[PDB]
Amino acid sequence: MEAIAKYDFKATADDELSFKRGDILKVLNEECDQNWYKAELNGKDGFIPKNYIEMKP
């Protein structure tokens, strides 16, 4: 799916990854935390919060 960073984000742990308000993210799974999505960016993959992004199913 398609994802779009809405606000800037700064990872807090090893399993999370950063972005900046505007990144085009690759949603690689979403079934484990209603509040987080696993997506791809910048040659990495990690958790990001859903209230910081907007999907584009």
Binding site: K6, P49, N51
Partner: peptide, 10 residues
């Protein structure tokens, strides 16, 4: 001012 990030870790 962005939103309060969810508590990660269910």
């Amino acid at each position: 001012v962005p939103p309060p990030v969810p508590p990660r870790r269910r």
